[model samples]
Target: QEPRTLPPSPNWYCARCSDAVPGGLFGFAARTSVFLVRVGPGAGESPGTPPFRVIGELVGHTERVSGFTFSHHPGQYNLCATSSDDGTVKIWDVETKTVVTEHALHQHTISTLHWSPRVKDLIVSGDEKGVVFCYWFNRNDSQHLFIEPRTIFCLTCSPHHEDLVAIGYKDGIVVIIDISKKGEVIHRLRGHDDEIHSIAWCPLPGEDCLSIGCYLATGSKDQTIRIWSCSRGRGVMILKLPFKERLWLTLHWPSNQPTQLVSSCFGGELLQWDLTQKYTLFSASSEGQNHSRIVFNLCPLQTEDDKQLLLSTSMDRDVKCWDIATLECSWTLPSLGGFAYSLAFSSVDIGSLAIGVGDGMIRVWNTLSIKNNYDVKNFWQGVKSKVTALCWHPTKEGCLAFGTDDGKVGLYDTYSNKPPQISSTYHKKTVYTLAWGPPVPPMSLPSLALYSCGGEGIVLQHNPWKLSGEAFDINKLIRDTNSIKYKLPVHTEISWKADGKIMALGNEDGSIEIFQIPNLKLICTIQQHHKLVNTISWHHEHGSQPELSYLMASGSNNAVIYVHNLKTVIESSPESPVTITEPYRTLSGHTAKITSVAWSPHHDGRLVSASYDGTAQVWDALREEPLCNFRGHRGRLLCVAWSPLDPDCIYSGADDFCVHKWLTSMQDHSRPPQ
Candidate 1:
């Protein structure tokens, strides 16, 4: 009954682990381990040798882990921060005995966190509330000494200055705060239309002197990572990391190595980019018999000799250590029972590691002795969700939470073996977005909640084990009559407003309809375009203002756009109740049907559209022409999504069997840019 309750929880264990001793034993172990490991230097290479290693693991969260980051001053110790399903931030000390710190984040799991290298004690955390907190940890007291006020989903601290913190919220806003000045938001970085997920400070040395050198890299669910030169607050590079399945995570300057980056995908693969090499170094899949496994997290280890090692943890219940210089597996360590969710290396010693598992167990391992002693001990357990994502919730303090894709959300209570006290699952679909909520009344449920988005335009509110559903129902609410039968067409992409009361649907018949959620009532229909509508999105805040609120943008097969303002139509047609208004304007630029259209959450006048014409165009929403045209896809662009978290980044999927992440700032040539 009732879908069997989805097994109460799925059980995942490491099937196997072996070296490349011949007859594909490594391959066999890789596949059963879910192919989470990637051997560099191409297949047969010894450990500590060239090409480097790219290993990853997928620890499926009942929901998704939305954001991740490294600890401030990673040089002191290797630590990573991640927010996910079970509404918590997990701090993983990679070195030593896989030590972990579980911090009670928001009511829901955390979505994003930013560690400040300048002020090692200060770290910023964000959540679904659009609120943010600047957490100050006092190592001496072993407690969070102070926290600031504000809400955001994504955040980053200026690499050059610890005082500056930049944030991306659900409202599609990018705000820079000066922490030294009592967390005063000094600037608002604009240019994204959807949720932003990841941001990075430029790794270039000396360049930090120039505000531009303090550039930031941001990745959004919308499929793009935009590089912004903070000096002018202008986007400088827009690199697209495309994929067939959803692109969930990305990182820049791996191992703190300048200009190097990597991204992970829902389909189970890892991609590498080297700015110095000026080419995609490689793309590896976790789909092969031995290695094709869902890859969840990847980190490059910086050695004491100034070399780089790639270390990855995955759902296959294994940790892989690789020599980045050789791209080969230096050694592989097996875990007990569940898949590894989060991993960190010791800043003090790269050979030491900390790992968090799906079963809520945090373990420590010595890489130097791993080959001989692969066994591990549970340093800490008793968390709620199978640890989906782990980060150093707090550095050196050993404070972290085990975030599960399931609704079980809570901080790790190291003192007690009992599971986390706080847990909730406020979403219907898998919880994909988790952020630490703003600091409010603590001891009241970690002031944060998780935001989840999944199939059927569903937006869920997750609070630990508690779950709630919100539908964007503009179509039903604004319609004059409830008699219209509007069947959502095949392959249609529908999205709801942030409030979940209104929804926008892209139809196959080249029309965009705004409707009320759940009821499926039609509000207004825009028939201005003659092609099939592929994607639609609603503005965050909607109210009485006709033009200012209730905005909808659509991309169609006819290579044109129709922008509609329900507020405007409602205000102008008080008498003619049902007649829909002509589009506020038709944006034309693509040579073929526009497959995707996304509004900029950060900027007022900007929006982006992609199409089968093998191009994506940026336009001024009010204007009828394109401001810039992007031609990069090798084949037809099937879909495009703007990051709700970052304005400058956009992601596109293509039939070419590749997903490309394009930034608004990069100049596009007809040929493949990569």
Candidate 2:
């Protein structure tokens, strides 16, 4: 059993991808760490367990490992280079597995990395400080550092010219460079609208004559993959997008397999795109299992008999060998611990497969003896709904319920490996709202009932605890005039008070109504905001007489969040309270519409919210500002919820066809020292 408390040393986070090096004989992989694992049949290893054994470790990167690559020579004694946020790029000798040079070539967090293909011993790297650099392994090394401009996010060398390279920026621009000419700008391709995270040479070789253009591919955080034809230093092709939704983190085109390009995404997706079909061929499973797990490394695997394969690594601690042609999993190598930061393969001496874990441990599989290697299955895994709203269960550990864009409700158990169990179509329009009431005698429903409001403006009580039956109450709480005038419908928001008796409904017309449940009678109404309220959440039970200390958090379309402390004016009445009361606190952090609002399920003083700004902020209901934040969603965040069971767990649903899970250790929760 996992201890109720966990050690501070291990914490879950994010993914940064490593691209495949498809060069030389059969290529290997290289990340911040180098693994020259020689793999093949007579090498004698079972197909299931990759023969990986770490030869040694080279030290240098102090912060996070960003970009790395194995030398393309495919030589027996090739070298590997790695970059990190520590602002240094180091080159390592793959033979003895030791550092050849300690180069501090950048003053900023060095991120994007690449080793020149045609420019032997040449490497290019970029940093978040908007700096781009080029280094020659045989030159001054780092004494005279080369730097270039504009928030460099990704870099790649041209396969056609030893001096030419492509650089991507945060401003969504791509620049072609002549590094050999002391940073000469060739041309710029202003195609993307967001940051480019990946840039790769099209594995298909260009005609040897240097007079023609070469096709290049770039993937970006903007959810696009644009192929460019560069000639006389300018992008000459029409901008096209064959990839959408997930943000591209890395692009890998194995030279051995010309028609396919593998892309790793920020959403933990390992997808192979068919350049021929002009669409995604399939999502490769990581060992028959998949989800929103981060996988950043892709390798064109070389087998003993001279066949090719692809390997993808994930935060789940599993390395999946992908048969690119079959788009199938060959086998899974479960690593020790931490996200696999690197995966290296080799066709030469010591033929080894090396993997680097986020925790700094390196694991290598021995390539010498085995048989029986083949995948048993490829399981499809992910949320099967276009989700619109998400809410945590009130008393269960991992129980969750979410509303889908298609008017369906899915009850999921996050702690279990099963998919969400859903009910029959509940609404014809988007089921935009769902909230659970406190467990009470009306708790005759074993699964416990919940409340929901849809585009129709009607509220219904439904049983989410039971597997089957008519989940909702037989009547509607509020009904709007059904129209045939071809008009659009709006959403309704609902919240349950801790008392288990009072319910709050925020209507589309900007009115907040409190009603008594069971009896189903109206208690009061308040004009909370000028615009329609989008979300509403009540505080958890605290102390004796919890009813008197009701605190609620609410947000609306006008970029304002309200904290209502009803205890201030409602205690005078035993059954019916005042008709209206002003909010005790107002929050103005979100620059865009506040899409959703929630209070900490464990503490009444803590609140959380999602916004159209693509950010989720955690605030103190007692303080006047936000405490911490979690961002990165390019699309609007639709909803946010704090776990009712774990004090540190929270969830956010977004329009990006994905959801993000956050873990806040108690250390992360306390306010930073002033």
Candidate 3:
């Protein structure tokens, strides 16, 4: 049987990527939104002051836009293709502002997109679920899908041969595919010890046809940037990234330069590689002006005067143009027009450039922006981002649970600077929130399960190793409750008690519901807030408290917070009905809608509320007014939380591209500590 029919369509940005159109035009892909920007060519645009003008715009995918690129012959710069997490590929005629064609090509998120200069209007996309698709936009309207045994993260079309495509995948596997032969595997290259992130066909210097270059460049999450010979089917060069410790994200080959290339890395460093007879020729960025954060992609262009320049973007919000000759930035575009990542060029018009901003919120850009756990040394290392949702391990020290826009969770053990065996395939959506679920074996050591809530709804449970399976059970990650569940109310935020005995979920229907853990049964539903509930917090870490009561706090979209004392109620026996009660103390201070609230660490009356009005209110004592409006953020503050580890600290990040930590100790000498 075939799959279900296509659902209704809505185009919005979620995944960010782009390509430059040369001259001065560039395109940006964020969510399903795609638009072009024309900088300069005909007029007086001075250096460092390029024009910021919008040309054409259209939405491509309805969900999780992943990657995009322009076709070379490409209808003379009229066509571009975009891939999404939705398993759909959209071919757009930007000039006409409509989709030329679209293909539901993959079953999982398409991780890479490349246009076939060898085939007329042809496009190919690689997916994480071990698949690829070859589509021809203007000819025969045909497509060929190939399945790989391993996940392919990135791929590139060959400049020398029309049918040759090289793909990089998990476990350091790289294979060359021949599109001319209907997706046949031509050769396999090996040696990197990890998953690959970027792949590019090298352009040889002596070959004007760009065919003389027979090597393939692959960038991996591991330390090596390898050069493989397509002809020899063997590794030719293994270039350790400039910073020996950093992993490479992407590699770009300058069209006319042989043995010369550029690469960007997770450390936000960019470097030029000049291979001289198997010897490294000063392949470092002299100025080290690269990003101070993760650098996704780098676009290279050789000027008319034979000078090479690279366009780069990062979480830093700066798009800098680097001159290869000086190994320094020629000029930089400060701040940002939008949350941008990945860089691209049309490779034809040389007039436009594009970048992608992800999701409707500013978060897809901030996950990797913070290096701030001042005490936690490796807060953000060897990790990728636009942090979607994150949570803390209830039982482990520094075992952080977080995921980025990539839809892959990082079960990172900060001390180890590594993750557990369980990673991707957990959920292919931006995880909105994460919670450390019950311990393994109904109460074990070290290993614990996780509850992840993503874009739409539903809380999922993932238990990595059963010691029960003896082997990893792929299907165990599946989540569906056979027990009682609140189907009427959609869940927004979830909280787990310190001991993992009771779990609570905030609902869209203005209610807070708690469930008995391990056995997994619904216990009670407390309805007090009139409007939709936004956030919920359990008084789990009652640090330094004197026999604190079982408490929970909830804030609503109606600008009111209802604080509760769980110890006041007891579980009903089989003979009685479930009881519902109001909070012991009610708080209302925010003039605007309240988005989130967090209870204090030690049963203190103090709590914080993030408001839609772009501020966070400090509350303690049910005052008619807040203790003080902390001026949380310039943008809409979406969340607020008191540090579980520290009493006088609070954290909040906004709807705009911003994250802020409010320190009470930094406020005043006498602000009445909780």
The per-model lDDT (C-alpha) reads 0.48, 0.57, 0.58
Tens digit of per-residue lDDT, candidate 3, span 1-674: 00000001122211126676555445656335664554444213333333333445665466656677876663466678888767788888877778878888577767878877667677888777767777777773665556477877777888778878888887788888887677788887878788787887767522233222377778888867887777778887777754344444677777656657777755667766775432222224354556666666666644333455666656554555666666676554433232222111121212112212233112111111122111112234434456556565545554455655665555555446354343644455556567776643333323467776654545666554431223222112212322333334566667776667777777677777766645445566787877766667766454456324366778777866777766634344222225466676787666667766766654455777777776777776334335666662445666555544456656565654333445665543222112
- In model 2, what lDDT does residue 672 have? 20
lDDT of 2 by residue, 1-674 (tens): 00110001111221222333332112222233333334455333434554432223334556656666667765522577777666778777755667787578677776667777776777777776756666778884532324445677777887768878788887788888776667677777778888776677776656232222676777776766776767544443332444244443567776765556677755556666665554443444333344246565566756556557776666554556666677666555443333222222222312133322233333333333244222111111233434454555656655566665556666766446676677654777666677777433334424457666776665556677554556554233322211124432244777777667777778787777665655545556677787887787777677335652577778888777887776644454335545665777887677778877766646657787788877777877677666776653435777565544566766555544223345654224332212
Error of 1 at 287 (Å): 9.2
lDDT value for model 2 = 0.57
Q: lDDT by residue for model 1 over 455-508, one digit each (tens)?
A: 233333334323222312223333334554665343244555545555555555
Would you estimate the TM-scores of all the predictions? 0.36, 0.46, 0.48
Off by over 4 Å in 2: 1-115, 118-297, 300-384, 390-400, 410-422, 438-447, 464-491, 543-548, 568-578, 601-604, 631-635, 643-653, 656-674
Question: On a 0 to 1 TM-score scale, where does candidate 2 land against the true structure?
Answer: 0.46
